[PDB]
RNA sequence: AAGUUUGAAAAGCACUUUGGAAAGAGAGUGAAAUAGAACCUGAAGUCGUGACAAAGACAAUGGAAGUACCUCCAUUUCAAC
RNA sequence: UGGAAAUGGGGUGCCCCCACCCGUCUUGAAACACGGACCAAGGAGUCAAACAGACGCGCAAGGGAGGAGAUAUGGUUGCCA
RNA sequence: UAAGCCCAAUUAGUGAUUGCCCAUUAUUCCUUUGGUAAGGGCGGAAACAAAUGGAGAAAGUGUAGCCCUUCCGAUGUAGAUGUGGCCUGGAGGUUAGGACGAAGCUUAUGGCGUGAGCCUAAGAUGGACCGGCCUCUAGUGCAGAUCUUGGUUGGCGUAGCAAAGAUCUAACGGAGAUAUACUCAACAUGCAACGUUGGAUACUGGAGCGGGGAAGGAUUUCGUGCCAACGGCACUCGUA
RNA sequence: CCCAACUGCAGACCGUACUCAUCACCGCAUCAGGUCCCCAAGCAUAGAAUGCUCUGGUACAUAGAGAAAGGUACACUCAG
RNA sequence: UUAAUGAGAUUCCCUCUGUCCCGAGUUACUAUCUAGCGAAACGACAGUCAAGGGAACGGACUUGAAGGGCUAAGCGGGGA
RNA sequence: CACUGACAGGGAACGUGAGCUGGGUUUAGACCGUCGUGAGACAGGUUGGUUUUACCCUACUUAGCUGGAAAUUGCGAGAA
RNA sequence: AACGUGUCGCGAUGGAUGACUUGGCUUCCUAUUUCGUUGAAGAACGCAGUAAAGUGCGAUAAGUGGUAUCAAUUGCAGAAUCAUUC
């Protein structure tokens, strides 16, 4: 799962990624995309406020027949959610990215996220049992997440 | 059902750092690591991403003519030629 | 002699005018007739025998085997079934 | 005072007998293709180096068609036939390519062909085979048979995961926290969910989620470790 | 040789864990179905009806928030 | 023909009632919102109408009338 | 039969079953009559007999967000 | 605006294609070539320092003996001899 884009200045950037996360791809897709252009500290604050349920993750693409909320108005939407499993996974990834920036000698307070990509990982198979003795797939959809941030 | 068909050789990634771990970020080996492990080549379909093109509602696609903008394409020409 | 000027090609959009969904059975399909979500790989006039005609070739009042022998080979992994 | 109906005109009692607009039709011009095609040329006329008029000319069904001139036809289901027509695997010949990169794969890479297709360019693709031509040969060309196998996919984070009533609390255990740029005292920025023990509340109500056996199962029994996958939520727990 | 009361020595083989079920068996599964036997307490009551209870067992079966319409219910009521 | 018997078929009467006049209120579990998890059916392409013709009952065609885009909960007219 | 001003006739796939209901009609059980040698038959009678799926698109019902006069552009300039 | 659409670059998912072939299929040939109560074929259970399957073997159990060969086996470990036979 290589990085699809390269940073403008490599020495002033930090990279982080995770493969086969075992989080729902669609929920993680929405969670990671909202921080694409944000400063690292602002992204961390938003995730904490999502866990506190004072702010929400806007669901822009995979939002078919989900509920509506007022907390999505700040993103220009009406449908949003609070996917805590995706959120805590993304916060761990941000911590790894911050550690990489610290290791390279950069200041995390000045790091701005520049690239966020979420991909559909290989699917894990389970089965569910249906009426009239039918067996039917019960699939798990993990995701690949990659990001990098650069000093502003 | 299923070719373990990585590489010439395991030389199968020491060591540093973050992480409970998985792994990530570095660093190394190798001609090649996008050859990293049941790993040669890696198509189609589908999806993510950045850049750009725009676009009401005539479902979309299509035909014929132009035009706007773009073009890592081709060819020609550059002096009384 | 330039990141050049031209002409052609390619790409995307837009105008005006055209333009019913493929395959199929059927007198008649755009059909309120049936098969029709996408892609990859696979998927259907073949082999043998009898006869006939057309055309090519050899010979011709004659044509031709076939089976089997013979030895170059009573040799050679094989070429040489 | 038709843009209706009937009749009649073509710029109007002026001097003459074509108002205007639309075809895959007609005439004509250019190009292609095929003919029951029609003809001409094919005994190299002579002469001609570079520095500074050219090129070709094949006795021919079919090709980049030997060349030139001329005339006519050209749509079409089922179907027939033809094609120096296209393409695929293999064989007999011939001629080439490849570590300075073969096959395969990719394309806003163009060029050529009416077309099947062929060829070049680029790969910041690949890493060892392979192209053209004549002949031979066959398991030789896919869009669809409720076709076969494999993979994918919208529906979709949707339907739902609602019988068997019900859980609460503290401490301990655990990576599973009380996890924060600046500002800022804590609330308004780390949520949720756990295993054990003690309390609390309730359930099973002896025809029992009690204690033992047969059939069936065969290590599920016990202890320690362990959380990748599995127990359709979760687990630090487990018949994993 | 036969007995009695002793005594001395020797008493082989296989089975034996666990389960027997709203999770250990069958039903594709830890499936509200199916599956033979034994032991069976207190009170009310005619009682193996039904309700509650000491012993033993259990809170395991996705949960949280929470008065939309419409539903399901081994949930009710309604003037004349 | 027939006493007794019957989850058998039929008619009337008493009692009774939300069967109805004619609907209303309440409860548990759903739906609804959230966390975790997560399908299938179906899927030519698609999806606003009127008339006209048409394989005589069009979402595509002719001529008109509509049509800014994207969404949540419902609903059963159509999608022969 | 009764009330009433009046109790008019019709259409909408003989409107309307993923709206219900299932009495009838039209399976398999069974009885009778008639018919048939028989198996069986009868727009003759009788009794008993599983009514499945919407979460898709439109339509309708409500419920949110939000561009836009060159109806996204032109800078393309029109004031009830 | 936002969903959504289209194109290009780069990634993911997915294992087609090519190259590779200790396999299959098919056609020939050779011969002191045809099992077993002297217990066969088949079935079962065991055997290694380390050993589930498979293979080999049978309490002499990944083998004993003999002949030839002529310095190994090999993931680790073990091992007199480094060798005319012993
Ligand atoms: N760009 C648009 C799309 O390109 C596609 O094709 C693209 C790719 O299949 C193709 O392959 C590219 C290659 O060009 C490029 N030079 C290198 C790249 N590695 C390749 O990409 C390939 O490898 C990478 C990983 O290495 C994968 O992530 C990726 O999925 C795979 N397609 O490059 C093509 C772009 O020209 C499709 N043909 C088509 O759907 C569409 O036109
Ligand atoms: K001609
Ligand atoms: K010729
Ligand atoms: K076809
Ligand atoms: K989907
Ligand atoms: K035990
Ligand atoms: K699991
Ligand atoms: K009540
Ligand atoms: K009785
Ligand atoms: K129209
Ligand atoms: K009806
Ligand atoms: K019967
Ligand atoms: K009944
Ligand atoms: Mg819903
Ligand atoms: Mg919703
Ligand atoms: Mg089920
Ligand atoms: Mg079953
Ligand atoms: Mg590569
Ligand atoms: Mg622009
Ligand atoms: Mg154009
Ligand atoms: Mg017909
Ligand atoms: Mg016909
Ligand atoms: Mg048709
Ligand atoms: Mg019709
Ligand atoms: Mg038909
Ligand atoms: Mg048919
Ligand atoms: Mg005149
Ligand atoms: Mg023709
Ligand atoms: Mg072949
Ligand atoms: Mg393309
Ligand atoms: Mg074939
Ligand atoms: Mg195909
Ligand atoms: Mg739901
Ligand atoms: Mg629920
Ligand atoms: Mg319940
Ligand atoms: Mg349910
Ligand atoms: Mg805090
Ligand atoms: Mg907490
Ligand atoms: Mg009780
Ligand atoms: Mg019991
Ligand atoms: Mg145990
Ligand atoms: Mg689970
Ligand atoms: Mg015992
Ligand atoms: Mg026991
Ligand atoms: Mg028991
Ligand atoms: Mg059970
Ligand atoms: Mg079975
Ligand atoms: Mg008493
Ligand atoms: Mg009882
Ligand atoms: Mg009792
Ligand atoms: Mg249970
Ligand atoms: Mg349940
Ligand atoms: Mg009453
Ligand atoms: Mg009875
Ligand atoms: Mg259909
Ligand atoms: Mg209509
Ligand atoms: Mg239709
Ligand atoms: Mg309907
Ligand atoms: Mg009628
Ligand atoms: Mg009707
Ligand atoms: Mg019905
Ligand atoms: Mg209906
Ligand atoms: Mg009935
Ligand atoms: Mg009846
Ligand atoms: Mg009848
Ligand atoms: Mg404007
Ligand atoms: Mg303006
Ligand atoms: Mg073994
Ligand atoms: Mg012995
Ligand atoms: Mg020796
Ligand atoms: Na692809
Ligand atoms: Na793309
Ligand atoms: Na013409
Ligand atoms: Na002609
Ligand atoms: Na009509």
Which chain H nucleotides are covered by protein, judged by CB under 7 A?
A: 1-4, 9-14
Please give the nucleotide, over all strands, whose C1' is closest to the CA of residue A144: H12
Task: Note the resolution in Å, 1 decimal.
Answer: 2.2
Greatest Cα-to-Cα distance within chain A, rounded to the nearest angstrom: 63
Per-residue DSSP letter, A5 = S
Does the annotation flag A3 for ligand binding?
Answer: no
Secondary structure of residue A65 in the 3-state scheme? coil
CA torsion sign for A116, A4, A17, A86 is positive
A38 CA distance to ligand 59 centroid (A)?
A: 71
Distance from the first to the final alpha carbon of chain A: 26
Parallel, antiparallel, or unpaired: how do β-strands A111-120 and A143-151 relate?
antiparallel
Q: What's the CA A69/C1' C13 distance, rounded, in angstroms?
A: 38
Experimental method: cryo-EM
CA torsion, points A150, A62, A18, A106, in degrees to nearest 10? 10
Which residue is associated with the tokens 């996360």?
A21
Residues 6 or more apart whose CB falls under 8 angstroms from that of A75 comprise A34, A58
Residue A94 contacts residue A32 (beta carbons within 8 Å): no
From the list A129, A139, A149, the residue with the least C-alpha distance to A44 is A149
Distance, CA of A98 to C1' of C68, in Å: 95
Under 8 Å between Cβ of A111 and A81: no
- Closest nucleotide to A63's CA, by C1' atom? D157
What are the start-end ranges of the E strands in chain A? 13-18, 57-58, 80-81, 111-120, 124-130, 134-140, 143-151
Q: Based on the number of CB atoms within 10 Å of its own CB, is A39 exposed (0-12), middle (13-18) or buried (19 or more)?
A: middle
Kindly give, in sequence order, each residue whose CB lies less than 8 Å from that of residue A102, ignoring residues fewer than 6 positions away. Answer: A108
Give the pair of three-digit tokens for residue A56: 């929400």
Strand B lies under 7 A from the Cβ of residue A147: no
93-122 of chain A touching strand F, CB 7 A cut-off: none
Phi-psi region of A132 (alpha: psi -120 to 50; beta: other; left: phi over 0): left
Cα dihedral sign, A58-A46-A34-A123: negative
């Amino acid at each position: 799962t290589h990085y699809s884009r390269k940073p403008q200045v490599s020495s002033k950037s930090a990279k982080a990624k995770v493969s086969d996360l075992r989080c729902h791809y669609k929920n993680t897709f929405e969670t990671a995309n909202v921080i694409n252009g944000m400063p690292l500290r602002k992204a961390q604050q938003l995730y904490r406020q999502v866990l506190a349920k004072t702010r929400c993750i806007p669901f822009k693409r995979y939002n078919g027949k989900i509920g509506r909320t007022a907390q999505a108005k700040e993103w220009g939407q009406t449908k949003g959610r609070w996917p805590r499993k995706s959120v805590v996974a993304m916060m761990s990834l941000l911590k790894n990215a911050e550690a990489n920036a610290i290791e390279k000698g950069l200041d995390p307070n000045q790091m701005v996220i520049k690239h966020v990509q979420v991909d559909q990982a290989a699917r894990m198979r389970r089965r569910t049992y249906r009426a009239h003795g039918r067996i039917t797939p019960y699939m798990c959809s993990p995701c690949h997440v990659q990001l990098f941030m650069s000093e502003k």
